Amino acid sequence: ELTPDQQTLLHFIMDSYNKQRMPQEITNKILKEAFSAEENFLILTEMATNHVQVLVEFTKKLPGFQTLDHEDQIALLKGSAVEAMFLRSAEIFNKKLPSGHSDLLEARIRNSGISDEYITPMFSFYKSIGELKMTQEEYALLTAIVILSPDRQYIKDREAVEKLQEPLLDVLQKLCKIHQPENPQHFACLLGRLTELRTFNHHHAEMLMSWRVNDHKFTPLLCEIWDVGSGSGSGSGDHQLLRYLLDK
Ligand SMILES: Nc1ccc(Cl)cc1N1CCN(C(=O)[C@]23C[C@H]4C[C@H](C[C@H](C4)C2)C3)CC1
Numbered sequence: 001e002l003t004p005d006q007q008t009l010l011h012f013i014m015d016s017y018n019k020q021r022m023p024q025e026i027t028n029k030i031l032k033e034a035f036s037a038e039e040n041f042l043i044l045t046e047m048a049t050n051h052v053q054v055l056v057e058f059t060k061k062l063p064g065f066q067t068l069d070h071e072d073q074i075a076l077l078k079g080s081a082v083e084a085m086f087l088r089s090a091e092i093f094n095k096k097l098p099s100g101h102s103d104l105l106e107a108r109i110r111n112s113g114i115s116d117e118y119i120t121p122m123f124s125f126y127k128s129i130g131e132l133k134m135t136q137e138e139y140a141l142l143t144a145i146v147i148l149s150p151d152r153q154y155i156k157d158r159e160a161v162e163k164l165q166e167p168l169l170d171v172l173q174k175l176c177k178i179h180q181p182e183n184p185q186h187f188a189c190l191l192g193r194l195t196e197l198r199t200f201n202h203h204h205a206e207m208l209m210s211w212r213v214n215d216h217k218f219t220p221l222l223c224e225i226w227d228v229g230s231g232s233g234s235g236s237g238d239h240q241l242l243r244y245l246l247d248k
Pocket residue numbers: 041044045047048051085086088089090092093105106109114207213
């Protein structure tokens with residue numbers, strides 16, 4: 001059972017996590033669009049861009065996130081985007097889409113000019129995440145914990161970040177007791193898939209280097225948050241788009 005303050009915190013998180021969905025225009029493209037590598041790749045690009053917009057809105061409302069330095073805010077956004085995208089896509093693929101949407105979406109991902117050395121880890125992770133059979137609250141807390149990670153590059157005040165991250169980890173452990181009482185190692189399997197999740201930072205960096213992927217013009221938002229051509233760092237002047245979205 002949760003403390004009053006853990007319950008307040010959990011309700012803040014859930015209210016922000018739920019204000020976030022995939023737009024019907026994007027969902028309909030999975031059926032509507034022609035089936036070619038170029039059009040499949042552009043659907044994935046539109047999903048990634050929407051993922052990032054949603055991630056930014058969620059991030060802004062994490063309790064205490066607004067009390068960090070603007071440059072550290074940028075550094076948490078940049079550092080967590082890839083992991084938060086793969087965690088959210090796993091939720092979508094396992095829990096939100098009808099089975100027909102999920103089957104077709106997978107076919108389009110497998111036929112978008114991305115090499116199979118990046119695809120199969122993605123889907124192996126999706127299956128490994130799905131067998132844990134997580135509730136919405138576990139996805140929401142795990143995403144908050146990924147975002148408020150005191151280990152990202154360019155954070156000036158890591159103690160401020162760890163102090164926000166520590167109460168979310170307590171809540172998560174209790175939630176695993178409450179919703180998975182049969183399995184007392186559930187919490188450890190969750191954090192174990194955090195380890196698998198971080199491997200996608202390197203997979204993704206490799207993917208952006210691929211010659212297929214560079215035959216392509218990313219969206220404004222993806223170029224900024226993934227440093228596609230940009231410079232790396234968290235300087236305020238170097239991320240006007242992110243600052244704009246952060247300031248609402
Ligand atoms: N966004 C989403 C929602 C549901 C499901 Cl089943 C899968 C996904 N993707 C998995 C994560 N992704 C990517 O890594 C991408 C990585 C690079 C740059 C973008 C275009 C593609 C090449 C695929 C984003 C987007 C598609």
